[PDB]
Amino acid sequence: STGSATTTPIDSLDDAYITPVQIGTPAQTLNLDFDTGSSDLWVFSSETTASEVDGQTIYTPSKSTTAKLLSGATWSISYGDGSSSSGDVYTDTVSVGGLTVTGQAVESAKKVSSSFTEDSTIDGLLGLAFSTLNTVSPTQQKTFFDNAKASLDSPVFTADLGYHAPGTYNFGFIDTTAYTGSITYTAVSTKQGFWEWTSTGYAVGSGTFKSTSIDGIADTGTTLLYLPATVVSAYWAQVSGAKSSSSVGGYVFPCSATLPSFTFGVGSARIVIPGDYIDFGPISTGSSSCFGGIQSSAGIGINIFGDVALKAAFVVFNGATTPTLGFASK
């Protein structure tokens, strides 16, 4: 089997992407944030504290003839941005782009933190990291990809995120029309539960490539590109007026600037992030200070190849017995 679904930016900055997901019988369609940096499929639901729902579409398990309470199971997750959610668990039928999993754990939110409530466009998350990170207790549950894998034509999914435009998540096949050149595959460590890999270096604009190993994670659920402070300083040094602002929380730059590109290495291959992809717009409405799309990871503990980086590429998440990642230009 295969599946193919369009993923759409939630706003004009590409702050996140939503993909429609069918849950239950009859189908209830929710727009979920596919997140290769986590491993829980959770939704706003009829059980979510009413004051914490503000425009999201909810899953109502009592209206699904295939929903079953997973007795005793609870979940609770906290994300790198400080947001969180928790609740109980049902199993139900979940379909993405024509690919159906029966018995998928659907984690129903009883509580969500303010940032989720405040984002009316995201009805939940669909985790695509390794199932060892799944938070369901006392019986850890499998991701949608893990459950579908055996049925797929090939044990892979691909992320093709658009810049200011829709893109595609495919399951079970590699669309050879969706990229240019060849796909370069690189080793993955699953020891932390992430799609963790090592970039071979970077370049700023038309500058020379610096060969240096940068361990980080391919994370579709993180908006920006978080790299070591040395790398980020070298980038922003090429932008007149750019500075790190403690009050704003990162590098800012004059909105009048033209940003240079940023290149990262995948083996001997190179992925070029155009400068425009690094512009996240005014820090506050009407400001002429703009927020940078490349930020320091120094306070995180891990480098994160988020959407800024991934949307410059066609990315293969290869869930073969030994997982690997593939990157192609497009």
Swiss-Prot record:
Enzyme class, broadest EC rank: hydrolase
Single GO MF annotation: aspartic-type endopeptidase activity
Active-site annotation: D35, S199
UniProt keyword terms in alphabetical order: Aspartyl protease, Disulfide bond, Hydrolase, Protease, Signal, Zymogen
Domain Peptidase A1: from-to ranges: 17-328
EC numbers for this chain: 3.4.23.22
GO biological process, one term: proteolysis
Disulfide bonds: C255-C290
Reaction(s) catalysed by this chain's protein: Hydrolysis of proteins with specificity similar to that of pepsin A, prefers hydrophobic residues at P1 and P1', but does not cleave 14-Ala-|-Leu-15 in the B chain of insulin or Z-Glu-Tyr. Clots milk
Family: Belongs to the peptidase A1 family.
Protein name: Endothiapepsin
Native organism: Cryphonectria parasitica
Residues of the full protein shown: 90 to 419 of 419
